[PDB]
């Protein structure tokens, strides 16, 4: 059941493609989003840019903000401030040789770099837990595997490679043979975590990247209610960056609506950002109590 | 040792630095003003360059009371001694930006710092290429190597200076710049530099086919009453890419030559971290330097490669 859909327009980036966004967030009575900005015919040449919402389905580069030399930007609120992250790619003579999540904290126009995750780990996401501890999802996929970890820290400055690498494995069984992990994590009223996730399947081969969700219990490390909630075909049509990404959606996360439905934001085809209007995916596990109101 | 127990191995550069401060000829000086960065400090700039009929500089932008919180921003020249952040340009999450022209395009670099729980854990040079408003990231140097600089040689090859000790090697094409190439560079004749650390900021091709290097050389100065100073002087030398020989090594600038400015911390009271030179119509040069990790100035000096040829490289993009 899809109740609506749109592709976002992004002004102020010279017609470049904008995709794999953060969720939208608010600051000083405006709405913002971070976008991954890249030329359609260029690969691994992304920057992350802060955009201000200026109209229905329309954002414009905010000229005051610095830009970040990162792919796949994401935001969360921890202890009353923004934590911003993205992938920082290292190349060796034009070839990708490493990639690591970089983390910034502060206010949206005043972000300060404070840590990187481990070498070759992309899928790190944070959330504030009901008791005020910080939850960390990790993704182990450097050794052929594709496993999700979870750990906690007290303070964002404690986010270290050692903490991330030591995260206890979650019950990954429900995910089947999917690679990926959360894009956005929500605290629910139950104290459980609602995860909006990206899972890729190779289907004997078709490359599928699907919008998924699951509920996680920080007390037991159990995963519940794993499901698909979006595919690229749900969004308005758009030619993918190359034909091999014709069924690739890289989820951004959800935004609750007054009516109790939500906007599911996703990168699509590595060329655009859209949303589909869907039913609340964590129905029966509590309402979202986290926000990104800065 | 002339410092006795204060330092039993005084850097051999100390007499050169004091002698330069007695004998220097300075024809003018200024501190640059930067608009559009919310009062933040701007320092350790690239040299100025031209593009599309305007003048630009990259600056390292950091709050005076913040440490290891830099971004590199493209500034457009507004007036004499005055630049403003260019709003169209992206920013780079780098320290100590530097530019050079290779094979008709800009090569842009800076230091990318990695932290682990707020503490510096790694740093490496990142390199971009293209046009000034359209730079594309293509390589990083080795872990913990800051002092890598490029130049286009007389024969069209690319010269690479490395800092382990200063090294030199060549490649054909900028996409060949790899950790493996950088780490395999042969050592240069270190005799004149001695036990002073640092390396080139900016390299120029001269009409002689030699390289003019504008360099940063430093040492630690223990003071009887004061704290330990991190001394950085502006230096120059001429390099022969065929023999790895160094000629005409000298001091060409020190912090005290520039207009006064309170350093970021007291230990940087004699720190001038050079950016490089810009030729003037009158045959003198503007020597641009970061000063005190708080500002960018220039001093007007004699051409430091006098007698080794005219600069034939450019940064006219
Ligand atoms: O702090 C003094 C100088 O030290 C050097 O090693 C570099 O880190 C420069 O960026 C700095 O200006
Ligand atoms: O992170 C480096 C590189 O890795 C993968 O190939 C994809 O996620 C690309 O979008 C990205 O540019
Ligand atoms: O598909 C359309 C979409 O493509 C790119 O992502 C950008 O140029 C957007 O501004 C535009 O709306
Ligand atoms: O005052 C010295 C210098 O300090 C900082 O680098 C900036 O505020 C500059 O604009 C200023 O000129």
């Amino acid at each position: 059941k899809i109740y609506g859909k749109a592709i976002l327009s992004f002004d102020g980036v010279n017609g470049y493609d904008v995709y794999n966004c953060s969720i939208p967030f608010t600051y000083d009575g405006k709405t913002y989003i971070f976008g991954r900005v890249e030329k359609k015919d260029e690969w691994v040449h992304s920057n992350s840019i802060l955009f201000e919402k200026v109209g229905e389905n329309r954002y414009r580069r905010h000229p005051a903000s610095i830009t970040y030399n990162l792919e796949d930007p994401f935001v969360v609120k921890i202890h009353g401030e923004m934590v911003f992250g993205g992938t920082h790619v290292t190349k060796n003579g034009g070839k990708v040789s490493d990639y690591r999540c970089e983390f910034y904290h502060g206010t949206p126009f005043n972000l300060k770099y404070f840590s990187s995750g481990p070498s070759k780990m992309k899928d790190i996401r944070l959330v504030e837990l009901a008791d005020g501890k910080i939850g960390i999802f990790t993704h182990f996929r450097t050794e052929g595997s594709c496993l999700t970890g979870f750990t906690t820290i007290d303070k964002v400055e404690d986010l270290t490679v050692e903490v991330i690498n030591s995260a206890k494995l979650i019950n990954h069984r429900p995910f089947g043979d999917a690679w990926g992990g959360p894009s956005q994590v929500y605290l629910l009223s139950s104290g459980l975590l609602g995860c909006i996730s990206h899972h890729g399947y190779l289907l004997d081969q078709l490359r599928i990247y699907a919008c998924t969700s699951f509920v996680f219990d920080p007390a037991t490390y159990e995963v519940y209610n794993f499901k698909i909630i979006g595919t690229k075909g749900c969004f308005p049509p758009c030619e993918p960056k190359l034909p091999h990404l014709a069924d690739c959606a890289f989820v951004s996360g959800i935004e609750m609506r007054n009516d109790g439905k939500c906007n599911l934001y996703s990168g699509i085809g590595d060329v655009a950002e859209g949303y589909i209007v869907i039913d609340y995916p964590f129905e029966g596990y509590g309402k979202i109590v986290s926000d990104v109101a800065f």
Side-chain angles (χ1 to χ4, degrees), chain A residues 2-200 202 205 207-260 262-294:
Chain A
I2 295 184
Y3 306 96
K5 60 187 79 186
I7 293 176
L8 300 183
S9 292
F10 291 94
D11 303 332
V13 288
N14 302 126
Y16 275 41
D17 286 348
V18 183
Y19 64 108
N20 296 3
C21 293
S22 75
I23 60 170
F25 66 85
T26 64
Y27 181 65
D28 197 48
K30 290 150 167 143
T31 299
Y32 294 95
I33 204 174
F34 282 103
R36 176 184 177 173
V37 181
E38 195 172 66
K39 211 165 174 295
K40 183 179 296 302
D41 60 356
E42 290 177 0
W43 281 265
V44 201
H45 287 293
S46 292
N47 292 279
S48 294
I49 295 183
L50 183 57
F51 295 88
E52 176 190 7
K53 189 176 156 205
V54 288
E56 173 69 1
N57 298 328
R58 199 166 105 266
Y59 289 77
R60 181 195 42 69
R61 171 169 175 193
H62 197 299
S65 176
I66 68 176
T67 69
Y68 304 90
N69 308 136
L70 300 170
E71 302 173 345
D72 298 351
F74 55 94
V75 298
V76 67
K77 189 156 139 202
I78 306 293
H79 298 159
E81 63 172 359
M82 178 174 277
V83 177
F84 165 83
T87 308
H88 191 81
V89 182
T90 300
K91 288 168 188 183
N92 189 27
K95 295 167 66 148
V96 171
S97 59
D98 198 14
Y99 44 85
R100 308 178 64 162
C101 285
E102 289 192 348
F103 297 93
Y104 289 69
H105 71 138
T107 60
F109 284 89
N110 195 33
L111 288 174
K112 306 294 163 170
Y113 171 63
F114 71 91
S115 199
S116 292
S119 169
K120 304 254 202 167
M121 181 181 300
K122 281 204 180 181
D123 296 303
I124 307 170
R125 295 293 183 280
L126 268 55
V127 66
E128 187 173 338
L129 302 178
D131 67 358
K133 301 319 183 87
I134 301 161
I136 307 156
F137 287 92
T138 70
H139 185 224
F140 298 108
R141 75 131 105 128
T142 45
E143 303 277 20
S145 307
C146 282
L147 297 157
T148 301
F150 180 84
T151 194
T152 68
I153 58 181
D154 292 334
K155 291 170 200 312
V156 84
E157 308 90 274
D158 295 345
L159 184 64
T160 64
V161 300
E162 292 74 24
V163 160
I164 288 158
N165 276 335
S166 67
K168 169 174 208 296
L169 301 183
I170 85 179
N171 180 14
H172 57 269
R173 282 187 205 267
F175 306 141
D177 201 27
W179 78 86
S183 285
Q184 195 70 27
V185 183
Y186 303 85
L187 180 54
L188 308 179
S189 58
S190 58
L192 301 168
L193 302 185
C195 297
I196 303 295
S197 43
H198 52 265
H199 288 102
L202 275 165
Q205 317 269 138
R207 249 174 218 277
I208 311 303
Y209 309 61
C211 312
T212 62
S213 65
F214 61 92
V215 172
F216 172 82
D217 190 341
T220 62
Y221 275 59
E222 290 306 318
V223 162
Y224 301 110
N225 197 27
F226 177 60
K227 57 199 172 174
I228 301 189
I229 59 169
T231 64
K232 184 171 183 303
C234 298
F235 295 79
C238 58
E239 169 153 46
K241 195 174 175 85
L242 278 173
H244 77 284
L245 299 168
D247 212 340
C248 161
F250 182 90
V251 79
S252 307
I254 59 178
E255 175 182 53
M256 289 312 300
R257 296 151 52 96
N258 62 338
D259 69 2
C262 64
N263 301 320
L264 180 65
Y265 290 89
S266 190
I268 53 179
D270 290 8
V271 293
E273 189 74 14
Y275 66 88
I276 55 167
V277 185
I278 59 165
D279 288 315
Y280 182 55
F282 312 129
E283 193 56 53
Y285 294 85
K287 74 170 166 179
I288 288 164
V289 300
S290 51
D291 60 65
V292 286
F294 300 102

